[PDB]
């Protein structure tokens, strides 16, 4: 609230620009524009600003902003100019104040500027930097803004930081420069500031910038390498602030609807493995809201996540990983439909899968892969009492009895479950 408080504080202060309209101390000419268009609610004034032709508007006011430069003198002049530059609802709109003769009005004047990031100076600089997205003027050099400390030193220190980030998120709209910033290490900085703990408003701004960046399919594909989806689902679990849940849901929706390449969408299975976001949706569906976006997106995500888990439920990659011996806890293992209809696929040539899992159980000592294999074998033998006789003939029951007494009581418990499924009719 610091910046709004300052703005309200110095809104009421009326400077004596008339004492030097074209007079003493402060210059002597640039009050011919100020005296015009004092009525900001006037259609005539906002349409006759073009009569200025830019000659004074943002041509001499530019470098007047540096003419005055006192913590009292230029704080009042600063706001009396930049509050008009800030309101700007339709007064300039698409760069009406043009100033074609000199480029410094458009951009290169702020190199000495970007100093004292506290008395609103960096704030005016950021606001005039915020003249690209909804304003018709193409930035001359992206690196003249992306690599300056106006945001870097404000990352760590807070309403001034919030306002800076607000200008940044207002500007991050069109991909032609968001790409330029993504090529930089800015993604790492966004991730680090995200991991940093701070106010929930700032966290919202960060996820909001992430949502804006989610527009780009190919650059999302490039930035797949970072673990943004689970860090975002984690902060979703850690915080419920309504708008934050909506924006995170919209970001996941953006990923799912862009989907550059199904091959590069390995995160489809991660979205449940890393944390079951469906379990959160199971509760969030019960809470209804007036916003059609929330309901439509949660329904659409429920359907798509159903498709994702159903497609993930398969035997080909399953048997591939079971052969390779890397048994992670995939949710397909517990999928009942696999053992209701697809159970006979485990019966390969000479029960190759079952025998090699017996061999891998004998070989590996890792409790979690042992548990996974034992549970799969138990759920398979649960339905085929003929394969139960085959397994008993093989002698894997003795292997499970040996693994029952074990350092990991979880493996012991799972081994008891498996031996019990064998104790069915036996």
């Amino acid at each position: 609230n610091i910046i709004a408080a300052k703005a309200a504080e110095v809104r009421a202060n009326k400077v004596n620009w008339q004492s030097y309209l074209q007079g003493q101390m402060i210059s002597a000419e640039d009050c011919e524009f100020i005296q015009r268009f004092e009525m900001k609610r006037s259609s005539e004034d906002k349409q006759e600003m073009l009569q200025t032709e830019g000659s004074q508007c943002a041509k001499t006011f530019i470098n007047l902003m540096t003419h005055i430069s006192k913590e009292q003198t230029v704080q009042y002049i600063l706001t009396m100019v930049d509050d008009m530059l800030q309101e700007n609802h339709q007064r300039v709109s698409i760069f009406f104040d043009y100033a074609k003769r000199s480029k410094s009005t458009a951009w290169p004047y702020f190199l000495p500027m970007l100093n004292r990031q506290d008395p609103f100076t960096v704030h005016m600089a950021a606001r005039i930097i915020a003249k690209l997205a909804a304003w018709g003027k193409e930035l001359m050099e992206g690196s003249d803004l992306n690599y300056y400390f106006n945001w870097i030193k404000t990352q760590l220190s807070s309403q001034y930081v919030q306002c800076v980030a607000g200008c940044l998120q207002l500007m991050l709209r069109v991909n032609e420069y968001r790409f330029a910033w993504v090529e930089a290490d800015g993604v790492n900085c966004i991730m680090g500031v995200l991991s940093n703990k701070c106010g929930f408003q700032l966290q919202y701004q960060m996820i909001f910038s992430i949502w804006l960046l989610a527009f780009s399919p190919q650059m999302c594909e490039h930035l797949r390498r970072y673990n943004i989806i689970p860090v975002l689902s984690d902060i979703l679990q850690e915080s419920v602030k309504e708008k934050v849940t909506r924006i995170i849901l919209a970001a996941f929706r953006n990923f799912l609807e862009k989907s550059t390449e199904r091959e590069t969408r390995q995160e489809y299975a991660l979205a449940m493995i890393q944390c079951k976001v469906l379990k959160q949706l199971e509760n969030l569906e019960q809470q209804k809201y007036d916003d059609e976006d929330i309901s439509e997106d949660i329904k659409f995500l429920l359907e798509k996540l159903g498709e994702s888990v159903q497609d993930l439920s398969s035997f080909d990659e399953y048997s591939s990983e079971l052969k390779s011996g890397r048994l992670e806890w995939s949710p397909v293992h517990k999928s009942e439909k696999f053992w209701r209809e697809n159970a006979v696929r485990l019966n390969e040539k000479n029960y190759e899968l079952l025998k090699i899992l017996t061999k891998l159980l004998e070989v590996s000592d890792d409790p979690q892969v042992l548990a996974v294999a034992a549970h799969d074998v138990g759920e398979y033998v649960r339905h085929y009492p003929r394969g139960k006789r085959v397994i008993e003939q093989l002698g894997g029951k003795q292997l499970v009895m040996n693994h029952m007494h074990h350092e990991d009581q979880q493996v012991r418990y799972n081994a008891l479950l498996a031996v019990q499924k064998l104790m069915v009719h036996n």
Binding site: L170, R173, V174, Q201, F208, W211, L212, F215, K243, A250, D293
Partner: protein, 56 residues
């Protein structure tokens, strides 16, 4: 004051709430409008690029 000051505080917080909420809503509508913009522009580029390629 205390009661009147509390009333003023309540009014200020309500104004802040509407401000933040519907400001974010407005930008959400504008972002949907940007997606909108790019989709329609892409369809247009396809339709025109067709005839361009035959003529050339």
């Amino acid at each position: 004051a205390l009661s009147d000051a509390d009333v003023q505080k309540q009014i200020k917080h309500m104004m802040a709430f509407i401000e933040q909420e519907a400001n974010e809503k407005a930008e959400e509508i504008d972002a949907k409008a940007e997606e909108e913009f790019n989709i329609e522009k892409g369809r247009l580029v396809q339709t025109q690029r067709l005839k361009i390629m035959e003529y050339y």
